[PDB]
């Protein structure tokens, strides 16, 4: 066990999907995994391990924000043999042409956190995903008839920002989605020598206030999970 | 309701105690509150409302890290009429004379987060608790015969810090405990116009491991909760 | 002697009250101290030692600005056995409800100086007063029937600031008074191992001019000095 | 014309290859392009436009360093309709497993320049390539029997850095090559809404030392240019 | 009058010499000026006006540190018609070849203060003297047979620095003397459209602990004052 | 030889003039030097060595931007015995009184580059010229009937700056010319113990607009080179 995960080596697969919401980890395990067992419940951060098309896969919540997800991803990598993290989450859009229910793949993640400056001698660390994992996710989405956008996320420390002006800056520089984790996960992956990827579905538009039907939103969420799971199978080959 | 709290105005008391762990909020509601009802379970972040000695009191987890607790404390302040937040958490000691299970009251909170620089035009915002709440907690602790040290916490973004030498700097400057929230809660309280206090118990020593037993953790946790609850009653006078 | 104080160990009491203006130190010695003797005049920075109600007390100017007061407070701590420093100064208000001649107690001090970043590895050091000294000043003020607000000061490097908009940010974050020393004194106290408190009277309003008379300044100055001196007597118990 | 390019709209292809050494532009034009014409000569920064397998391609040097290449890439994008920039350069390696003459593709670029902080309100902009361009280069290299590594470059402002220890940090965080341009090119591409990619060959191992032959270096340079040119054809699908 | 100078327009000459120590301003006026009158005594910061070889000249202390001298120099420029400030002070040496009693002229001043970053949008403002004033001082020193060194000063915020390492950095980059004011005076001069110069005598060596005779030190101090006064006469022609 | 200069010790004079445009080096050699010989050609950065009135002088371009000119000036100082660098370039003006074709001498250079913060532990290094070189240029200009302005340049990293408002700040603080090199050259000179000077002619007024003739621009360039060369002879006293 580690300070935030009451489990032993082998309880997790070498790939872990991670939503922010632990109740979504339970949702994913029940919906997509066969023979799924709960393997962590410390602090309510439910984690599960099962199989997808015979392949051992884990899913566990990471909580909200860079500090929370940095704890869980570190401990998985250093003590549970985890080689790949796929964050599966929601994000807010700032670009007009990025629509509700688009699937966004974060090849990079900008941030207003200081954690990577702390790692990188106060210089600019480009927080990036693993290229092969990005390619696997693009290819899995194509096989499913979903065309994902690949680009930069912005990982914010303040969901309730005082700086409304920063959203115009994100739009100017082409940020595809705003979430709260990717840059921290990518920093952990680089620090501890593992691989990570963040996929998000667009849940909100800071530009055009608008909302679709729940059935359509939930379909797209499941499409993101299918993309993540099928991308693992591609990487295995 | 708000994006992370499925409740309505009136469901929360005007004072909310907040551990990081939602399961500890459940324990506090079951152990210390009469007629406790669950008022939130979104993302598993359990929150409850009941009475302590006739006084309406709420307790809700805030998750780990400044970004997580900033979400919950903001929404409580802006949409649920919450006037006082008392974080009741754990922390790690860097000072040799600060012992396991000591109670620490954070009159100020240092941090390596950027959130207060974003608020404060990149200058030094001294993230401080409400003085009256600090005095109430000191007095409540004295009435219970519990020692309590008052001073600075350090709110870290990285539990697994790559900069071990910074602990020497914390120690040099008298930091009483390392946790991950106080400076963010104090920044939210100032931004959104409420009052806050962080109380912690020393759960680990960052230099010396110092293992504790389960029965000792519960006694000291209960002591911290008693201090917080009794401090509310003092402030009501 | 030290580079800026021509005195020897024992010439100062273990508590030193410090206005910015050396002429105010002379006035304090003449008005409040019995058997006062001058113990320093290097650079005209007048310092005196006498007794208040039998208690040995010193009073010495510290000059204007963090660099100036950091010199004097350091040398007092390291070479003259000084244990407590009480700055007794003036400040400018930014909050509409903070009135001229109000007494403000700086439990914390914000700043735009770099001195604490230099100390604290470029992170946020919360520059705080000693809690017991804060409580002593609150209690002494209550015993004298004088109102006193407790909260954050802002210690500015530029009295003539080129950034007028920053006063809106100070006001937003509840800053009670703008002065030029507290955050530096609190940083010295932490660095060199002593205790400090800043008390100020609102001498000007940064928005509204608000002129005062000479007799009102003296009464309120005397009130601040009485609070400081009586707070020492409370701390001795 | 623009301040640094004496040409008119249409004189450049929508894709420009850019070496750092201006002498390589004429070499690339004569060796790889058909029907090349001269389109710029100001400051000796010769530019040429021709075709590769029928596809219009331009080539022009960018000069050493982020400020130099930022000038040329901006003017090409805003006044010459350029949609894709491929930098073709050399880099130094810090990783033991990265060998001399290896081909490195910069999906991201770290930097110690301030240019992207100036752009991005002093936050962390992840300077990234266009994903399709990255994959095109990977696939073109594979078709040529060259395995390319994809990851982070580091774009240095100081070739002669006074901070040797930063190379250890680069190694820890997996930096594949050190050059002086990619992060600046990627920032320009994001600022003005275009696409860019940096491909480098390893010319030195910064912390070890060993050499190659002139014929080996020419073969490897030619390989890089073939990868770049064939990658464009793949992008045209 | 201004908040820190109780005088009226005309009471000061259009050139003011400024030592840090107000008792030194009295020393300079009595030693070098004819018909000298005291024109300020607020906060004990003595200022005087007299004639040197028939030329109207003022001398007034500026206190220790950038915040103190920034107050006095601003108020002189904006409200007393002062066109030129000459700081005349002491400094500590870090270079081996810079000796006790050398005269140093600060054509530039480095600093660890934040005041110029506040003025200059967090970029690097090169805090420089007025060229003509530098040339006048060099020429006056030559006429007196003193060969002054012209170069960079370092203006420190902390006389008692915690960062001993910075002195090696100053030596590496050729800093001639360490004092506490020049960069702030030069920032004020630029902000308010006036001219300034700092001259110092070397009073201490952070390298070679050593001291000369008082008679020789005082001779060199008077040489610095003569250089400053004669340089004004050169500028007048 | 060095990585960017294929020459040996003695091939360069101890004084090197450096334009930004590499084509100007050959022009300066043919127009002003006697007996010139070619001493470098790598990357097309032609260097020449000859004599001016019997005095050995070299000329070689430095490329655009701080990183480019930092490479060449470092290698000249550390491997070719170069003692003085004179940059001879153009700049844009922000002050209304600074006219097209004015000669500006940069006694200091502000910057938005990070290179000197990297050198100087993130403090403010005042990037300054050598004083004697400044005065030599002023005196040589006066002997040629040219009045030169001496003050601060601003060395920009982005010719195409996204922050137009910074030009207002430059104007307020008296910046004479905007170019892209001086602060970097001055930092190298300080780092490696040599001397440097930047002279520029005003080629544009950034916030207004108007033009000159080709013959006027050639006359003004020739004037600048004559000033530079005659200033060297004055320095040799
Ligand atoms: N040495 C330590 N360091 C950082 N945080 C903590 C904590 C607290 O517990 C959580 C991490 O375990 C987090 O919410 C933090 O506030 N306990 N001990 C800690
Ligand atoms: N509006 C104001 N702003 C900044 N400082 C002060 C002060 C205090 O008085 C001095 C400046 O007049 C200085 O020591 C500072 O602490 N009073 N009013 C102030």
Residue numbers in the entry:
A (entry chain C), B (entry chain B), C (entry chain B), D (entry chain A), E (entry chain C), F (entry chain A): 1 to 237
Manuscript text:
PNPs catalyse the following reaction: β-purine nucleoside + orthophosphate ↔ purine base + α-D-pentose-1-phosphate. E. coli purine nucleoside phosphorylase is a homohexamer, which structure, in the apo form, can be described as a trimer of dimers. Dimers, but not monomers, seem to have all the necessary features to conduct catalysis, because monomers within a dimer mutually donate two amino acids to complete the active site of the neighbour.
First, a single-tryptophan Y160W mutant was engineered, with the mutation in a close proximity to the active site, but without significant interactions with ligands. The structure of the ternary complex of the Y160W mutant with sulfate and formycin A described in this study has a nucleoside bound only in two active sites per hexamer, located in the neighbouring subunits, but not belonging to the same dimer. Complex crystallised in P 6122 space group with the half of the hexamer in the asymmetric unit. Since phosphate was not present during the crystallisation, all active sites are in the open conformation. Moreover, even in these active sites the ligand is not bound in all protein molecules, since the occupancy of the formycin A molecule was found to be 0.71. Ribose of formycin A is involved in hydrogen bonds with sulfate ion, Glu181 and His4* (from the neighbouring subunit), whereas aglycon—with Asp204 and Ser90.
